[PDB]
C-alpha cells in the first residue's frame, strides 16, 4: 500500500508518501524507515531512486516514509529559505509521524539519507535516541560552506550577505541562511555520538561528494558498533545512475538490514 500523507513542521505543511506492507496484520507492528532526500532533490529522488528503495524496503517488511523537506517538492516553503537545521526539524517531525502510527513499532525506527539528506540523517542520529539504525547514501559529512561559496562569484557572495537570494544553478536560488548554517553541525564532528548501527554506501566515482569523507566517517565509527559497515560502489557515481549500481545499493541495504533482525516474517506467522 502506498498513500500520500501530510504533517506540519515549523508552521508549514509537508507532503510525503507512506509505504505500508500489505501483509501487515491487524495487531502487528512493523519496523519503519524515514528517508531524507538531497539538496535540490525531492522525495522521489534522482531517476526515482527513492521510489525503488522504498518499494524494496516495504517488500522486506518496513513501513517507509518519504517526504519533501520544506522548500522542496510539494511541501510548503521556498527553497531559498531552506537550511540544514530546518531540515533536521523536518526530519525529527517525520519520526514523530511514524511513532504515532499504531502499526509501526516505535522502538524499531531508523533513517536513510542521500547526500545532503545523509548530512541531516547523521546530525539527527547524533541527537535523537529514537533512531535505531542509520543508512547513508553518498552522504555529505564534511564542511561545505567554503566549497559552496567557492562556486559563486564575489559579487554574488556580497548580494547573499545583503539578503538576496542568489542563483546556485539549474534555476535554484538560495539565501545566506543556508550558507551560514550548513556547517553549524559538521557530521564528522558528531559521528562518534552515534552508537547504533550505521551503513555507509558511497561511490568511488562520486564527483560531487568525495569518497574521502565517507572513509573518514567510517574510520570514526567503525568500532562504535560491530554492525557498522562501509560499502564502496566500484564505478558508482553520486546518485548511482547506472541500473546495476542502483540494484547493488538496494541489495546491500537489504542484506545489511537483515543482519539487524528488525523484521521477523517467520515469527509473524
Ligand atoms: Cl528554516
Amino acid at each position: 500500500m502506498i498513500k500520500p500523507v501530510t504533517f506540519m513542521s515549523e508552521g508549514e505543511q509537508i507532503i510525503g508518501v507512506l509505504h505500508v506492507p500489505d501483509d501487515l496484520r491487524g495487531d502487528k507492528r512493523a519496523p519503519a524507515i524515514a528517508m531524507f532526500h538531497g539538496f535540490t532533490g525531492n522525495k522521489s529522488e534522482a531517476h526515482r531512486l527513492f521510489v525503488h528503495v522504498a518499494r524494496s524496503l516495504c517488500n522486506d517488511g518496513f513501513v517507509v516514509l518519504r517526504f519533501d523537506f520544506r522548500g522542496s517538492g510539494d511541501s510548503d516553503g521556498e527553497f531559498e529559505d531552506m537550511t540544514v537545521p530546518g531540515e533536521v526539524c523536518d526530519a525529527s517531525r517525520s519520526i514523530d509521524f511514524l511513532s504515532e502510527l499504531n502499526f509501526v513499532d516505535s522502538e524499531r525506527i531508523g533513517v536513510l539519507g542521500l547526500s545532503m539528506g545523509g548530512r541531516v540523517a547523521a546530525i539527527l542520529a547524533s541527537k535523537d535516541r529514537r533512531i535505531k539504525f542509520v543508512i547513508l547514501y553518498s552522504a555529505a559529512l564534511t564542511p561545505l560552506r567554503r566549497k559552496f561559496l567557492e562556486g559563486l562569484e564575489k559579487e554574488s557572495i556580497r548580494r547573499l550577505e545583503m539578503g538576496e537570494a542568489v542563483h546556485v544553478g539549474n534555476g535554484w536560488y538560495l539565501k545566506k541562511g543556508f550558507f551560514e548554517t550548513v556547517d553549524s553541525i559538521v557530521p564528522l564532528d558528531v559521528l562518534d555520538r552515534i552508537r547504533v548501527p550505521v551503513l555507509i554506501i558511497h561511490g568511488d566515482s562520486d564527483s560531487v561528494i568525495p569518497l574521502d569523507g565517507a572513509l573518514k566517517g567510517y574510520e570514526i565509527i567503525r568500532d562504535l558498533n560491530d554492525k557498522n559497515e562501509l560499502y564502496i560502489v566500484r564505478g558508482g557515481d553520486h546518485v548511482f545512475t547506472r541500473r546495476e549500481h542502483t540494484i547493488e545499493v538496494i541489495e546491500r541495504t537489504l542484506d545489511w538490514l537483515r543482519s539487524l533482525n528488525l523484521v521477523d516474517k517467520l515469527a509473524a506467522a
Side-chain angles (χ1 to χ4, degrees), residues 77-90:
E78 301 295 9
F79 182 76
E80 63 196 51
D81 300 325
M82 177 275 281
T83 68
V84 174
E87 295 201 342
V88 178
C89 178
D90 296 350

Side-chain angles (χ1 to χ4, degrees), residues 243-261:
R243 170 162 286 182
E244 298 294 323
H245 294 333
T246 286
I247 292 169
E248 294 174 322
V249 169
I250 295 176
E251 293 177 333
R252 179 97 306 278
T253 301
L254 296 174
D255 288 347
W256 183 77
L257 284 167
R258 190 193 175 267
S259 299
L260 308 188
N261 302 337

Side-chain angles (χ1 to χ4, degrees), residues 105-148:
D105 183 343
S106 284
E107 294 296 348
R108 293 187 167 71
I109 300 172
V111 297
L112 182 158
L114 172 78
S115 197
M116 194 68 71
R119 190 180 201 79
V120 169
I123 294 165
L124 182 64
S126 76
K127 300 169 176 276
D128 192 334
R129 165 158 198 212
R130 300 175 294 178
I131 294 178
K132 298 311 190 338
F133 57 93
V134 183
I135 301 157
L136 302 174
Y137 290 173
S138 309
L141 303 176
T142 64
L144 295 173
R145 174 184 160 84
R146 281 183 233 229
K147 278 173 33 174
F148 265 102

